[PDB]
């Protein structure tokens, strides 16, 4: 058993940048291979990034390719994906995904993984904070 804990998620401005993290349980150097998937009001779960057991095959989806960087500390059994140029279509809950098996090379399928996190929300929309 694998949990994980998604944070970074909120509110941000269309063209925009945030760093989600996703902790997973277990000692250091657990080495999962390891996924975001997103998904937004009214559309199917899809994949984002990913990276294998050992740290290779690095994969990102087409719709994110060039804007986001997925990395892994193997000290910390930590994700992040660093997600730039963000736009309304981005909005969604990410989700942490991490697989029971020594895979080397990412898999973008959802039913590829067996653990997943509660997710933590994406907001790319305009706004306005008033000031102090
Ligand atoms: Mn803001």
């Known amino acids: 058993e694998v949990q994980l804990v998604e944070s970074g998620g909120g509110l941000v401005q269309p063209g925009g940048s945030l760093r989600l993290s996703c902790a997973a349980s277990g000692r250091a150097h657990s080495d999962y291979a390891m996924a975001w998937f997103r998904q937004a009001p009214g559309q199917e779960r899809e994949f984002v990034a990913g990276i294998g057991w050992s740290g290779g095959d690095t994969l990102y989806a087409d719709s994110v390719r060039g804007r986001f960087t997925n990395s892994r500390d193997n000290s910390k059994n930590t994700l992040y994906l660093q997600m730039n140029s963000l736009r309304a279509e981005d909005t969604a809950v990410y989700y942490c995904?991490?697989?029971?098996?020594?895979?080397?090379?990412?898999?973008?399928?959802?039913?590829?993984?067996?653990?997943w996190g509660q997710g933590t929300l994406v907001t790319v929309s305009s706004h306005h904070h008033h000031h102090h």
């Open positions: 995904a991490a697989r029971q098996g020594q895979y080397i090379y990412s898999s973008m399928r959802s039913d590829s993984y067996d653990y």
